[PDB]
Amino acid sequence: QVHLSQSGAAVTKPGASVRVSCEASGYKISDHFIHWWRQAPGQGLQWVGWINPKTGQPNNARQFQGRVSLTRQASWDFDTYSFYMDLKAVRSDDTAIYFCARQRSDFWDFDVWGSGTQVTVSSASTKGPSVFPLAPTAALGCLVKDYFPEPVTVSWNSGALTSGVHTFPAVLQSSGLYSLSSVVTVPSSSLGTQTYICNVNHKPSNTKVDKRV
Amino acid sequence: MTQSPSSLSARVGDTVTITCQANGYLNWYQQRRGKAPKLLIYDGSKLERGVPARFSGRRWGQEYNLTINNLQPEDVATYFCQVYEFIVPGTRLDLKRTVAAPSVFIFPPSDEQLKSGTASVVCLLNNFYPREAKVQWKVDNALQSGNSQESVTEQDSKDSTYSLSSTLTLSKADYEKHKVYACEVTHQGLSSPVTKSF
């Protein structure tokens, strides 16, 4: 069926160039324009540009004039097409989710979207997190601090504890690394009795700590 | 060309209307946290295939309405309208539940982290509704007004509440000088601000 598969998350250094990809399949591709959109965290969508799949002709927003390149490579039988968005001279501003979307009609209704690619522009380089405890109905948690890049996963008692757990979304610091928190609530009684163990994994750096609280 | 309001709360079974100021071939999209948009209505009022009939749009002269009948829990999302390259900022929609005061906690810095030169103090606002809350940091009655970040969970799909953490970050040095640390938070379900201290 009609589908747009995008490449996975990219990390980029300031001043460098990043390439996002979209693979179209499942329909008459020559007959519909592909657009790129993007979404900064806590922001609306902004249009980047479009590309004509027959001619290869692109057009983009003036904000990106001279630093974005939309290109196309078709398959032989035309059953599949790859679409690229190359962004060069990247800035802080360029950190966002980038979506590809298929234009259905001549009037810009977008009925099929790719899933999005995260593009993080950052000075830093891969780093495992430092996990510190949030010590004590009662609350307790783990502060998972200064890691890179995202993501990390947090469990309690190896997935054996799930109810009452809140794992917060990561925030970005003046440092340029990310910190989040995982908290869980428990009755004041169960602390002497029960063993509570934050269990963090940050596979891109191959870290996997278990912390008692 | 704006959209109103910026946040809506509704009960299940209710009808909700979102209004767009825009002009042209106008399209409405639903977007779920962390996910791609989904076309609901195109061309002002045509309903996209596979979308439930409880969605409709009508052309209100210069402006356009989106309507959701018999609102449902899957309707919790952000809605926006688009005309060619132009997007209107959007409306968060969440489920209405009884007002619930925040459960507040404060965690001093671990001694383990101080060994690294940085001090983190955390406030936790647990399970409250509606989403709107404000946190402020007091220590020795000094009110800090830089050096703080805040993270908020999504409306919980079990009990319809929100949780919030504010992290105040310090050097090991400044942490030592002052001694007594406090979080103060204000919420609809609290008649007067509450503070936790260490």
Ligand SMILES: *[C@@H]1O[C@H](CO)[C@@H](O)[C@H](O)[C@H]1NC(C)=O
């Ligand atoms: C659209 O919504 C507004 C309120 O948001 C309502 O008062 C108005 O009657 C609606 N307009 C139309 C086209 O019925």
